[PDB]
Design a protein around this nucleic acid. Structure first.
Lengths: 143, 102, 112, 117, 49
RNA sequence: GACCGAUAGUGAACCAGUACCGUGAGGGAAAGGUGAAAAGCACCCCGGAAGGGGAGUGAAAGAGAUCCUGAAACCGUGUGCCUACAAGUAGUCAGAGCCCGUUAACGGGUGAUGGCGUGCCUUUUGUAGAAUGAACCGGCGAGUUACGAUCCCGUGCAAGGUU
RNA sequence: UAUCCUUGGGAGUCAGACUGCGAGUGAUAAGAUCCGUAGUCGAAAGGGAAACAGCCCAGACCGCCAGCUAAGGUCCCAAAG
RNA sequence: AACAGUGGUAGGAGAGCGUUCUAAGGGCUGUGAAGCCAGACCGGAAGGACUGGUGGAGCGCUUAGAAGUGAGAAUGCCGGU
């Protein structure tokens, strides 16, 4: 035999969760968030095809990675810009353009190619220290 | 009654009215097999957690033997010229529960 | 009910001819004939005339009506590349072709 | 007597192209290219057949791990209390039931507390 | 005896012919093959000669 | 004739030593089929002209003048499913939606996207390759037979067998 | 005990390759060049080392949505304190 | 029954399947043979046959023996594209 039960249906409906980001590290926190963005927070079919769930950071202007850890953070991209390989750090993302640290740190924890970039869309970064996403009923949750 | 039983090396969830695809057994047609290896009860019952419970005993009505359709397996070895093929099909049984006796 | 048609002995490539055939589909005979007649090429009045004559016959003998008919479908399919000599240089013996086509057309009544 | 071996050729050749169903491109429309895909198909088949069973395991472990966090324990000490109690392991497959049925989830949590780190 | 039961008793049913039509079902792929650098030749295709 | 059956076989199955090639000695092809019988398209319509388009023919007109059976490549036509933020030597395996409806296993159709990934034959230890050949599909074609020799194994006699 | 012994009938093979262990060559460097040992590969998939037949895991004719180790992990994705 | 299993190249050893033909015991056919094309064809380990449509005049299972005997690639061969 090879008959099998499932539990994908129950736990996937594109529900909405918020997760704090105000004064938070958003590094060690983000890891636990990524789990839930892929669909996994209870028994779920999730290493393979399934739509994710919405999980939203509430802030983006109080992201401090704390101590020396901050300064020597790594980020990369390889674009069609004449410099190719651009490399940046959390420290200089904090010194203007503070939105980008939270984006590339949660994209990185969801890649699968096509399906990976779908799950990414369900993230909204914001920066007011509040959500206007109360229209979709969010609630605080972590793994 | 809720139950889970052993089907050799694997387990299957089983209630008091459902068919289930199981491994091959000699039995077919209208025969009767029992699964007193019922090793979890839990849906309206409570178990924790010696192997087997005596508060339940799933009973099955053997309902025909069917087969899993043939599926060609093959290994080619290029420039070594081996081409050994095999096919798995084989008989299997299906049984229908309809009563989990206490 | 339906009228067939075919053209023989013309100069036009299959690839080329497919275009006009599929484009006259769903359109009345009265329109389709006019198109072909004033399409440029020397094969035009030839493929026109044969198609037109298929219509004519259809009325008198098989009880159909020209005005009512449309074009169910039509197409042109790859056939032999017809070698008819034209010089190709470098001392080489080769022909630039003058292909022919197998024109399929199915006219039919839309109103009986 | 003799035999051409030539009636046989259309039988052998035609079969390969007619066993290719749901295949893509022009690789199942051309004979000599279809051959090469039969070799692919068989090699791939056997490797993935066994690989997949590990992937279902690397799926079930995840399900349990998620449920486990919401009991105040984690997967290590959960599975430990299951196995050490005896049964209440319930494979890993069927322990997806901890979302679906509350009654089940309670028992797997009671079993967890029994033996812990 | 009978013409519908010609049945040799191994006076012509001793048989067994080594394969070469097979590509590697039995032994070998074609005549003149081994593993040496002199294979796939008419002359030198033999080991023993 | 325990010979061959239409790309197989004579160079040549047929108006072939023709066609075609060399000043010359001489080299050298492709090509079968409407029926049992022509009854080979009366009757009609249109076009400059080639042809067809209906109808009849006759057991059979996918038997209608490349007309037997008529595939595959090639080129189209209808329809079911499927996709406009996506990464690929092309499949494999998993789920999932929608569609359809098995003779029997009680059944068939697709790809939305996940996991995973070295062309066939060479040449070698090993080519997935930028050393080889092959545009593609179909046909055609090589492990053949005899006679000595040595084992096998089936038989006859049995110290004799053998022309 | 697919351990040894003996005879008869068919072999194929002289181009192996790479790694660990130990000696020689070298400009004392170079899957460099020579080999004793063991191993894998050749002549078996497959596991690990991000991307590698040869080290490390193991010898899988074939199916299982079963469990146990090795190598390798447990914060997440490409599974797990 | 129980015990044990190792199924891969050069080769050794063991069985079988398809294709044409001759043989003697047998059987279909114009009320539709051989062949053409599809099919979720029951039954194979693999090489492998039982159904419907078309087709339009001859066909073959067993038991045995035979061979240009299963392709494709040869700067292979002929035709179509």
């Amino acid at each position: 035999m090879r008959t099998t039960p499932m539990a994908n249906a129950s736990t996937i409906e594109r529900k909405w969760l918020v997760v704090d980001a105000a004064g938070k590290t958003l590094g060690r926190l983000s890891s636990e968030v990524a789990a839930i963005l892929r669909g996994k927070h209870k028994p779920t079919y999730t290493p393979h095809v399934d739509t994710g769930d919405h999980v939203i950071i509430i802030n983006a202007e109080k992201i401090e990675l704390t101590g020396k850890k901050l300064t020597d953070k790594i980020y990369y991209r390889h674009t069609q810009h004449p410099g190719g390989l651009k490399s940046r750090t959390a420290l200089e993302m904090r010194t203007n353009y503070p939105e980008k640290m939270l984006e590339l740190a949660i994209k990185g924890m969801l890649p699968k190619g096509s399906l990976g970039r779908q799950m990414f869309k369900k993230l909204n970064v914001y920066r007011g220290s509040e959500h206007p996403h109360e229209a979709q009923k969010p609630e605080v949750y972590e793994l | 009654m809720y139950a889970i039983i052993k089907t050799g090396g694997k387990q299957i969830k089983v209630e008091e009215g459902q068919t289930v695809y199981i491994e091959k057994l000699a039995a077919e047609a209208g025969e009767t097999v029992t699964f007193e290896d019922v090793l979890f009860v839990g849906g309206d019952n409570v178990k924790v957690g010696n192997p087997t419970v005596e508060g339940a005993t799933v009973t099955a009505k053997v309902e025909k033997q069917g087969r899993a359709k043939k599926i060609t397996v093959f290994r080619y070895k290029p420039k070594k010229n081996v081409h050994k093929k095999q096919g798995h099909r084989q008989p299997y049984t299906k049984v229908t529960i309809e009563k989990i006796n206490a | 009910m339906q009228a067939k048609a075919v053209a023989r002995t013309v100069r036009i490539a299959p690839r080329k001819a497919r275009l006009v055939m599929d484009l006259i589909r769903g359109k009345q005979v009265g329109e389709a004939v006019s198109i072909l007649n004033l399409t440029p090429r020397a094969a035009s009045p030839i493929i026109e005339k044969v198609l037109k004559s298929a219509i004519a016959n259809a009325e008198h003998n098989y009880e159909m009506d020209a005005n009512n008919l449309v074009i169910s479908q039509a197409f042109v399919d790859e056939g032999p590349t017809l070698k008819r000599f034209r010089p190709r240089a470098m001392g080489r013996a080769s022909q630039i072709n003058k292909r022919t086509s197998h024109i399929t057309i199915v006219v039919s009544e839309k109103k009986e | 007597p003799r035999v051409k071996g030539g009636t046989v050729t259309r039988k052998r050749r035609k079969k390969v192209l007619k066993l290719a169903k749901g295949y893509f491109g022009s690789k199942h429309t051309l004979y000599k290219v279809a051959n090469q895909q039969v070799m692919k198909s068989g090699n791939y088949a056997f490797r993935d057949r066994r690989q997949k069973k590990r992937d279902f395991r690397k799926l079930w472990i995840t399900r349990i791990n998620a449920a486990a966090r919401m009991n105040g324990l984690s997967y290590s000490r959960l599975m430990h209390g299951l196995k050490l109690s005896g049964i209440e392991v319930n494979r890993k497959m069927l322990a997806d039931l901890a979302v679906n049925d509350l009654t089940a989830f309670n028992q797997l949590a009671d079993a967890a507390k029994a033996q812990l780190n | 005896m009978k013409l519908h039961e010609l049945k040799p008793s191994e006076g012509s049913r001793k048989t067994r012919n080594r394969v070469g039509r097979g590509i590697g079902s039995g032994n070998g792929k074609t005549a003149g093959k081994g593993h040496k650098g002199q294979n796939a030749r008419s002359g030198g295709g033999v080991r023993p000669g």
